[PDB]
């Protein structure tokens, strides 16, 4: 089945580009005049006065929430008394169809399974050992060649001719011994 067709009705295609009419037709920049919405603009976004120009964190509209007894309003649990016991019924979230749209049917089955863990401690320790020392053996294999080639570069040689090279911007200068 096509699950999109189930909630097609909720999705009505839009009219304006980006969801707003031109400001001339409707001024969404102004604060809403509706009672209880003085902190919102006409389009529903928070007004600059509420968030910037008169932000409460800056000392505007000072109103301490806590009361004299150091209390704030707290909503209680849904309590039920049955079978000689006081029970609390937890709040279950609404069906995912309401929030997401797809109808919650024909859900693929995914069973409970505990964590996938590597076992056989003895075997695992050897693997960890190899992870460390196999690279180490490779390094040791390279070390001896490295020493040898370094010594070859710096070997003292019985040179018989010298050429002096000077680098300048932007050319090379060569000085050589002229034969007698």
């Amino acid at each position: 089945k096509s699950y999109y067709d189930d909630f097609k009705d909720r999705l009505k295609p839009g009219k304006y580009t980006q969801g707003r009419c031109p400001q001339s037709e409707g001024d969404y920049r102004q604060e809403s005049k509706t009672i209880g919405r003085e902190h919102l603009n006409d389009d529903g976004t928070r007004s600059k006065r509420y968030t910037v120009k008169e932000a409460d964190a800056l000392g505007y509209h000072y109103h301490p929430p806590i009361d004299k007894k150091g209390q704030v309003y707290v909503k209680g649990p849904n309590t039920v008394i049955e079978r000689g016991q006081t029970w609390i019924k937890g709040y279950e979230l609404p069906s995912m169809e309401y929030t997401y749209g797809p109808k919650q049917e024909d859900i693929p089955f995914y069973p409970r399974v505990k964590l996938n863990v590597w076992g056989n401690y003895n075997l695992v320790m050897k693997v960890e050992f190899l992870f460390f020392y196999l690279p180490t053996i490779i390094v040791f294999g390279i070390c001896i060649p490295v020493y040898t080639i370094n010594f070859a570069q710096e070997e003292v040689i019985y040179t018989t001719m010298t050429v002096k090279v000077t680098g300048r911007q932007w050319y090379w200068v060569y000085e050589v011994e002229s034969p007698t």
């Binding site: 909720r10 919102l40 609404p94 995912m96 964590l115 863990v117």
Partner: protein, 107 residues
Amino acid sequence: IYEGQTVQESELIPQEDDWVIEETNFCLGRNCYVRFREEDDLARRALHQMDSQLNKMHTRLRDGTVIPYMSFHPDEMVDRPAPIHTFSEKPLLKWTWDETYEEAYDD
């Protein structure tokens, strides 16, 4: 290394011959982008988002207990998208030990 909880043979003995592992689906359902309603203003869309949190969901077992959404790290425990103030009450990391004191018990 961790290899699961230790199990004793007696713990595997069933009380009935027809017991099999419960076939409860742990797929939370079918989801997609959270779809808001055009009629809902900023405040009510916030309520809508708070009611679509997967980390508030769980699976109820046959004995009434629930296995919740769980994660290795606490990054998956805040509301999505992350709110300005996340951990108002300090998350509790529960450790277990065998120590006990008499005051906790009564005879």
